[PDB]
Amino acid sequence: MNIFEMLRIDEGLRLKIYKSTEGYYTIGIGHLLTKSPSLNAAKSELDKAIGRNTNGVITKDEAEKLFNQDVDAAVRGILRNAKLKPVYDSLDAVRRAALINMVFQMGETGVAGFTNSLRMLQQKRWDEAAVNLAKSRWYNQTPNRAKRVITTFRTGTWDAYKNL
Ligand SMILES: [Cl-]
Ligand SMILES: [Cl-]
Missing domain, CATH: 1.10.530.40 (Lysozyme)
Known part of the structure; x- marks a missing residue:
């Protein structure tokens, strides 16, 4: 088991924007998009994160890329x-x-x-x-x-x- 497998179990995997347990727009493997109540605001954040016009849907590889970036940022935030x-x-x-x-x-x-x-x-x-x-x-x-x-x-x- 490792951090990746561990968090993939805790967060799951969803390819369309969804609302997290706190009601915030999220996608992929627990990648928070925005705290704003606006779906548009979330679709905007999403396209900006992916680098393309997603229309609120991403692929598995794209989720995994966000995931790798997020794990990394977590470790670095801890170290700093x-x-x-x-x-x-x-x-x-x-x-x-x-x-x-x-x-x-x-x-x-x-x-x-x-x-x-x-x-x-x-x-x-x-x-x-x-x-x-x-x-x-x-x-x-x-x-x-x-x-x-x-x-x-x-x-x-x-x-x-x-x-x-
Ligand atoms: Cl729980
Ligand atoms: Cl990002």
């Missing part, structure tokens, strides 16, 4: 973040994949706000961190996905994703 970087550098490979997932879902800024959980992760207090992470809107809004990521941080294995 003074609050995230140290955490990331202290973890093992599996847990690093769990931090990337959160950053991809919620943005570098949202993740840097889990101050207490970040400290526990850094301290390698797995069970405590797992409990702290669960006390969040994140966990209450998307509990199944949050559980998979939390389990990952807790056990350092891919068990929550084996089966999927």
Whole structure:
């Protein structure tokens, strides 16, 4: 298992614009287009991202290209973040994949706000961190996905994703 397969399981794959769990226009493998309520605004963002007149439909290769760019940006956002970087550098490979997932879902800024959980992760207090992470809107809004990521941080294995 790897970050790619992991997030592809968490986000799924859709070739037409759709509304995410937060009601924002998205496409492909969780690629957010815009927070605006306007479909046109989303189709515009989409064409600009793809470099062609899409008409709200992309191919599989194009989704995958957006995905590669997004994973990359997530890693780089972590590395450039003074609050995230140290955490990331202290973890093992599996847990690093769990931090990337959160950053991809919620943005570098949202993740840097889990101050207490970040400290526990850094301290390698797995069970405590797992409990702290669960006390969040994140966990209450998307509990199944949050559980998979939390389990990952807790056990350092891919068990929550084996089966999927
Ligand atoms: Cl883009
Ligand atoms: Cl969920």
